[PDB]
Amino acid sequence: KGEELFTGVVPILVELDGDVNGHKFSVSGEGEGDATFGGSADLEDNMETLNDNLKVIEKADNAAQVKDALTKMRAAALDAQKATPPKLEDKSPDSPEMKDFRHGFDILVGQIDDALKLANEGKVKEAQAAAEQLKTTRNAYHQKYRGGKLTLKFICTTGKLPVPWPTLVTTLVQCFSRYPDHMKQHDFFKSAMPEGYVQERTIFFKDDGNYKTRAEVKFEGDTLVNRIELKGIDFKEDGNILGHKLEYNYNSHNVYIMADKQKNGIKVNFKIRHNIEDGSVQLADHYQQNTPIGDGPVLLPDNHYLSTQSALSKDPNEKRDHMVLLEFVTAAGITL
Ligand code: HEM
Structure with missing residues (x-):
């Protein structure tokens, strides 16, 4: 079925058009993933x-x-x-x-x-x-x-990014998570391919504005593509987002998944923790649904979670505003 398309290394492309508080921008990314x-x-x-x-x-x-x-x-x-x-x-x-x-x-x-x-x-x-x-x-x-290497380089194609790169990580392909052999019937994401899935989120930044995103994740030829629109409203101009007070790093998280039978999809929630320069932490509350694009059948899972780890870095030869991302992710919560 769809998991078969992930048994080797898969090229990835990511395109994002954003507007936060009227600040428009575009990010474009490429790389590969290896879900086995x-x-x-x-x-x-x-x-x-x-x-x-x-x-x-x-x-x-x-x-x-x-x-x-x-x-x-x-x-x-x-x-x-x-x-x-x-x-x-x-x-x-x-x-x-x-x-x-x-x-x-x-x-x-x-x-x-x-x-x-x-x-x-x-x-x-x-x-x-x-x-x-x-x-x-x-x-x-x-x-x-x-194992499970996901690797991507993202460039801000419109010049300087008006939000910190870390805040865009979650938005910028959970089909590249490693589902252990026994949990393979709970992998909504791969099951929906190649026709793919729509991924919608609202991200609430504590005591600041919110992002609201809509994305399509699907195969275009041999490439897995992720294309997003993102609106941000209500951000504070001296807040941590627009004031650029977030550190250039990323923490590890649990992503909680459950079936949404009403919509032949999944509901998903988690809280991202963004380190701030002063030593504090700024929470990003994620609310997410995924819906298939195709009419073909799809695996609706039981309650389980993805466990994530990310390293952010820079390319010393790159002069444009950018982010290099390394990311490993594993489904968990169900034994034999
Ligand atoms: C302080 C340094 C390191 C830390 C904190 C660290 C941490 C981790 C963690 C948390 C995992 C995930 C384990 C799991 O999935 O249950 C992991 C996996 C792995 N690490 Fe490291 N690691 C370090 C250094 C290294 C080095 C130097 C190598 C190679 C020489 C390495 C090779 C691997 C491999 C191959 C895996 C996958 C394990 C598997 O899938 O069986 N690690 N590491």
């Missing part, structure tokens, strides 16, 4: 350890906490180094790709030791700053070896 699910219990678990202990470091007060945490990551690293990631199952253990994979953890352990030295000395601040640089390695290596 493959998983390793061992890596999953090593990666959980790594992930949790980084957060412990970020919030820690004293060196004792940071040392303890860094030591635990180091074990996970060396253990993760012996695994075979799902993306490289078919590769020889001594292949160039598997060597690079292992080399990724040689860098990572190197960086951890750097952070250990600073921690042992009592330099908690400096250690936390050295712990941050691990993220760069994670991002580089996730982009080569982690």
Whole structure:
């Protein structure tokens, strides 16, 4: 059926026309997605350890906490180094790709030791700053070896963007989520293809204006395309959106999905958390429905959720206003 069109890498194109508070603009993006699910219990678990202990470091007060945490990551690293990631199952253990994979953890352990030295000395601040640089390695290596890669570069084609890039992330292809083999009957998104689906949202920015978006996601030839119109009203000119007070980063979220039998579709809600420069957080409340375009039948799911992670970055050679996006996403909430 429609999931078959996602079994390999798929080229993507994104076009957005926006008007916020009268500020018109256009964003155009291209890239690819890779929705196939493959998983390793061992890596999953090593990666959980790594992930949790980084957060412990970020919030820690004293060196004792940071040392303890860094030591635990180091074990996970060396253990993760012996695994075979799902993306490289078919590769020889001594292949160039598997060597690079292992080399990724040689860098990572190197960086951890750097952070250990600073921690042992009592330099908690400096250690936390050295712990941050691990993220760069994670991002580089996730982009080569982690499953479900969605990758896209977006350019503001009308010049300077009058809203922060982070606020447009959600709007700018949930058909590229990884549904685990047992949850494949709950994947509305892929099921609707190639005729595709209409995706509508209202996004309420706490104590500021709202965005209201309408989009068509469908295959145009071999490309999965996402085309959106977006109106923003009621934004405050010294607010976080129009005042450009949002940090250039993105958090991880749960996206809650349920069937909407009335509309042969799905209703969807979540709350995006946008970090602000001063240290505060600004909530973006998402209300969403999806409706098929075609008359063909479509999988209506049970309650479940998508778990998301995103890295935002820049192309050092790009002079236009832009955003590079790396994103991994997995359906969850239903066992065997
Ligand atoms: C501090 C650094 C890192 C963190 C915080 C981190 C975190 C994570 C997280 C949270 C996941 C998702 C696990 C899940 O889906 O349950 C993951 C997956 C993965 N990571 Fe990392 N990671 C880091 C570094 C690396 C490095 C250096 C590599 C490669 C050398 C790597 C390779 C992978 C792979 C292949 C997956 C997919 C696991 C699977 O699907 O079985 N990671 N990581």
